Amino acid sequence: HMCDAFVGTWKLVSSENFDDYMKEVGVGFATRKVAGMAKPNMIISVNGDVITIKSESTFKNTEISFILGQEFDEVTADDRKVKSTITLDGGVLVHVQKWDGKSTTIKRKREDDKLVVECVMKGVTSTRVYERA
Ligand SMILES: CC(C)[C@H](Sc1cc(Cl)c(Cl)cc1Cl)C(=O)O
Ligand SMILES: CC(C)[C@H](Sc1cc(Cl)c(Cl)cc1Cl)C(=O)O
């Protein structure tokens, strides 16, 4: 029951600072424009110890499956090859991605009826809000 409050189907309803976050990450112009237009559905499920997070959008469909605390290799939607670790810290799902000596952190937390996503790359933060679909 570790992630119970995250499980479900969620739809993007707002975004702030995402273009600048993507610039800091190193995403190129065309991908930023098209990805920034995306309105993904995020589908979170749990089966035993395995958490799956799917994202579906007109830009890309992705899927990750993982066990908390256990590193995995990930090709991200913007085509970075990263090493990812996802943990639960005080009820917040914390996703760290490492590649090319760089690091970014994506945190997901339940706040009221929303799932709030905070993405940080150096000093640049973006906040994305999802609601139940
Ligand atoms: C928190 C943000 C870095 C991402 S952005 C994003 C992620 C995926 Cl997996 C797909 Cl298919 C499309 C976009 Cl645009 C988010 O999950 O909202
Ligand atoms: C959301 C995670 C699961 C990663 S992170 C990510 C995704 C996109 Cl599309 C952009 Cl533009 C920037 C970042 Cl940092 C992903 O899969 O893309």
Side-chain angles (χ1 to χ4, degrees), residues 12 18-19 22 27-40 57-60 77-78 128:
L12 182 73
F18 190 53
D19 188 66
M22 289 188 288
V27 182
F29 181 91
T31 298
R32 290 200 313 278
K33 298 297 125 173
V34 176
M37 285 289 300
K39 296 282 185 167
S57 69
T58 59
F59 167 60
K60 200 84 57 196
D78 63 306
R128 289 169 64 89

Side-chain angles (χ1 to χ4, degrees), residues 12 15 18 21-22 31 34-42 53-63 74 76-78 80 97 106-108 117-119 126 128-130:
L12 182 73
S15 182
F18 190 53
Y21 168 80
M22 289 188 288
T31 298
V34 176
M37 285 289 300
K39 296 282 185 167
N41 288 144
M42 179 178 49
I53 305 174
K54 293 178 60 167
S55 180
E56 306 186 337
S57 69
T58 59
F59 167 60
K60 200 84 57 196
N61 300 328
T62 68
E63 178 180 330
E74 181 180 4
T76 67
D78 63 306
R80 288 172 290 122
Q97 299 179 333
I106 305 112
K107 291 182 180 184
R108 301 185 171 81
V117 183
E118 286 172 16
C119 308
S126 173
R128 289 169 64 89
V129 178
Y130 291 74

Side-chain angles (χ1 to χ4, degrees), residues 81-100:
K81 295 69 103 138
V82 309
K83 286 189 191 292
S84 288
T85 311
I86 304 177
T87 58
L88 218 27
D89 169 31
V92 177
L93 273 169
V94 181
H95 180 177
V96 182
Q97 299 179 333
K98 308 295 196 186
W99 78 108
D100 294 345

Side-chain angles (χ1 to χ4, degrees), residues 112-127:
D112 301 319
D113 289 320
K114 300 166 169 19
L115 185 170
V116 179
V117 183
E118 286 172 16
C119 308
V120 174
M121 176 66 187
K122 292 147 84 195
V124 178
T125 309
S126 173
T127 299

